[PDB]
Paper text:
Leptin is an adipocyte-derived protein hormone that promotes satiety and energy homeostasis by activating the leptin receptor (LepR)–STAT3 signaling axis in a subset of hypothalamic neurons. Activation of LepR in turn drives the phosphorylation and activation of the transcription factor Signal Transducer and Activator of Transcription 3 (STAT3), which drives production of anorexigenic peptides that suppress food intake and increase energy expenditure. LepR is a member of the class 1 cytokine receptor family which includes the related receptors glycoprotein 130 (gp130) and LIF receptor (LIFR). The structure reveals an asymmetric architecture in which a single leptin induces LepR dimerization via two distinct receptor-binding sites.
Focused refinement of the LepRD3-D7-zip complex centered on the leptin–LepR interface yielded an additional 3.8 Å resolution map comprising leptin together with the three interacting domains of LepR (D3 and D4/D5), enabling molecular analysis of the site 2 and site 3 binding interfaces. At the high affinity site 2, the A and C helices of leptin engage several loops in the CHR2 (D4 and D5) of LepR, burying 750 Å2 of surface area. The interaction appears to be mediated in large part by hydrophobic contacts, such as between Leu13 and Leu86 of leptin and Leu503 and Leu504 of LepR. Moreover, leptin residues Arg20 and Gln75, which were previously reported to be required for LepR binding, form apparent hydrogen bonds with Thr441 in LepR. At the low affinity site 3 interface, the Ig domain of LepR (D3) engages the top of helix D and the CD loop of leptin, burying 775 Å2. The primary contact appears to be mediated by Tyr119 within the CD loop of leptin, which inserts into an aromatic cluster consisting of mouse LepR residues Phe403, Tyr405, Tyr409, and Tyr420 (“site 3a,” Fig. 3e, f). Immediately adjacent to Tyr119, leptin residue Ser120 forms apparent hydrogen bonds with both the hydroxyl of Tyr409 and the backbone carbonyl of His418, which is also contacted by the neighboring leptin residue Ser117. Comparison of the previously reported apo-leptin structure with the LepR-bound structure reported here reveals a substantial rearrangement of leptin helix E as well as loops AB and CD loops. This results in large part from a second site 3 contact site formed between the leptin AB loop and the LepR Ig domain via a primarily backbone-mediated β-sheet interaction formed between LepR residues 415–417 and leptin residues 35–37 (“site 3b”). Notably, Asn82 of leptin lies in near the center of the site 2 interface and makes key hydrogen bonds contacts with LepR residues Ser505 and Leu503, suggesting a loss of site 2 binding associated with the N82K mutation.
Residue numbers in the entry:
A (entry chain C): 1 to 141
B (entry chain B): 427 to 630
C (entry chain A): 332 to 425
The structure:
């Protein structure tokens, strides 16, 4: 498939998933000036530049999103998985042959917060994931 | 020979897939159980469709109008589906010629709410405006129809191409009376389907 | 460390909470704490009180029926240090 069609599809995917996060987060409105400890393994506090960082961060986001038991969250997770596959397609498109290595998650704290802090985990994960997606959209061009 | 046309339908929320197909050439097989097989792909529909050796079944229900009905949940925005009709019986097995459908190519939106109109008595063009639905985010083209008010309506048709245009201007014949207008929207490229019409908004 | 973690009361009466914040091996004082609701609204300083050096007390007034938010049917209130909120919270039910 041509690369340009792929890029347009990626951009549309980011825009649609951001919109879903937005209208599902309107009832879960949060303020950025509130930091909650115990979620240091949720990313979003640093800018994202390199491809592998995006891949690993999106994998972590997918993991925490499927760690939550709700249908809409399942849909978000499925869309992020499709986004990750699209990003891998782009990475291979760039004609860089660094061997693919993925994984490396030891999320015991994830289970702890899920059994203790369902609501906070959900809202913080959604907010930081939306911020991350905005950063990727900013740096894609 | 055997042939089954396939039609699919997608709601505007991008959370439901509906597909429908006609049973018009299976009634003549006594004892023929029906069933459906669908195979998913990583990305995109391929060039030449074919039968995937590994598949997944999915039951379908019979409605009153005479069409088999079944759905998929949850759905994938950019994943290809390869599905077909299969018939099993006691003298072998026949497979139908399949058809590939992209989920994003059969999406229709909701009608556009908050349709209004007014007559600019100064100039003479009818002014109407709408708001695009939240989904899909892709650019859309709108078609407009107007007419008089009464039992029977002799409509007139017109369209607006520029997706960014939330306003329109239209040459008219009478202005002291009351007109009727509605709108509908669809994707610019051509994929998907028309989305009904809009609620009747009466002019003043 | 909350007491009580939840409460039940219909529309038409006040509310009462009590929290103590634990951080690592240090317990913060009370004069610095600020309350929070649903991580969306900050409560003006008129609505607090201090019983002793180690507890933050808040008394709400003319509570209104809560609005459902997804599958959830309760509103959460958090006691936080500066801008650092602990994971646990109290449950508000009307
Ligand atoms: C028109 O709208 C109604 C309800 O808004 C819906 O049930 C119907 O399916 C729509 N028409 C088409 C062709 O989808
Ligand atoms: C609630 O607070 C009001 C003043 O804010 C007070 O008058 C009343 O006695 C309190 N208790 C109730 C309403 O049960």
């Amino acid at each position: 498939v041509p690369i340009q069609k792929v890029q347009d599809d990626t951009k549309t995917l980011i825009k649609t998933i951001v919109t879903r996060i937005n209208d599902i987060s309107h009832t879960q409105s949060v303020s950025a000036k509130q930091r909650v400890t115990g979620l240091d393994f949720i990313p979003g506090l640093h800018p994202i530049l390199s491809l592998s960082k995006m891949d690993q961060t999106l994998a972590v986001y997918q993991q925490v999103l499927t760690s939550l038991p709700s249908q809409n969250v399942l849909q978000i997770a499925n869309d992020l998985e499709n986004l990750r596959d699209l990003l891998h397609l782009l990475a291979f498109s760039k004609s860089c042959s660094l061997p693919q290595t993925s994984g490396l998650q030891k999320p015991e704290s994830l289970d702890g917060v899920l059994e203790a802090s369902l609501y906070s985990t959900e809202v913080v994960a959604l907010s930081r994931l939306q911020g991350s997606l905005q950063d990727i959209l900013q740096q894609l061009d | 020979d055997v042939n089954i046309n396939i039609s699919c339908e997608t709601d505007g929320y991008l959370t439901k897939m509906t597909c429908r197909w006609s049973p018009s050439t299976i009634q003549s097989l006594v004892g023929s159980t029906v069933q459906l097989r669908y195979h998913r792909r990583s990305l995109y529909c391929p060039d030449s469709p074919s039968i995937h050796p590994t598949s997944e079944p999915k039951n379908c229900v019979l409605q009153r109008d005479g069409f088999y009905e079944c759905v998929f949940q949850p759905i994938f925005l950019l994943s290809g589906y390869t599905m077909w009709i299969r018939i099993n019986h006691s003298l072998g097995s026949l497979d139908s010629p399949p058809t590939c459908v992209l989920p994003d190519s059969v999406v229709k939106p909701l009608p556009p709410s908050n349709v209004k109109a007014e007559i600019t008595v100064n100039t003479g063009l009818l002014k109407v405006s709408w708001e695009k639905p939240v989904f899909p985010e892709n650019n859309l083209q709108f078609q407009i129809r107007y007419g008089l008010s009464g039992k029977e309506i002799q409509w007139k048709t017109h369209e607006v191409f520029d997706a960014k245009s939330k306003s329109a201007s239209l040459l008219v014949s009478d202005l002291c009376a009351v007109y009727v207008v509605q709108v509908r929207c669809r994707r610019l490229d051509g994929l998907g389907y028309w989305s009904n019409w809009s609620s009747p908004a009466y002019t003043l």
